[PDB]
Write a protein that binds this DNA or RNA. Structure first.
Length: 99
RNA sequence: AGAGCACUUUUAUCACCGUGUCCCCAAUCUGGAUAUUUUGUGUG
């Protein structure tokens, strides 16, 4: 009847993530004015994608894959998620369609 | 269970290439630490 939550930390190392929206001849990273300084930010979406990739890597069945399409990246290999089992890892079975 | 917050910042790339801080020069010239001083006093 409790909902425990944690907080992690990472070892120091040079940063790699680039946030696009390149200006002139440099690729930049979004910053926040926490106290008038600059900081690095990683959006929760990429972390969610990494978690889903790890779940599909460990053998847990799922119904969503983003493959390297020739034209532009897209998400496919899905069906009706009528059972929450074997689909969506009990998370975010989003749908907006009317039919 | 908050005007339902997902599906995307993604995939590659040597600042590279050659180059004597080099060539001469004296720290040189003189100068008495000098002047005096009893380890003296007695024991089978």
């Amino acid at each position: 009847n409790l909902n425990l939550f944690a907080t992690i930390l990472t070892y120091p190392a040079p940063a790699s993530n680039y946030r696009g929206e390149s200006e002139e001849n440099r690729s930049v990273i979004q910053k926040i004015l926490k106290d008038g300084q600059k900081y690095a930010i990683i959006s929760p979406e990429s972390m969610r994608n990494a978690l889903r990739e790890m779940l599909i890597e460990l053998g847990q069945p799922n119904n969503r894959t983003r493959l390297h399409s020739e034209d532009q990246l897209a998400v496919e290999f899905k069906e009706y998620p009528n059972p929450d089992k074997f689909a969506d890892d009990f998370l975010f079975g989003y749908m907006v369609a009317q039919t």
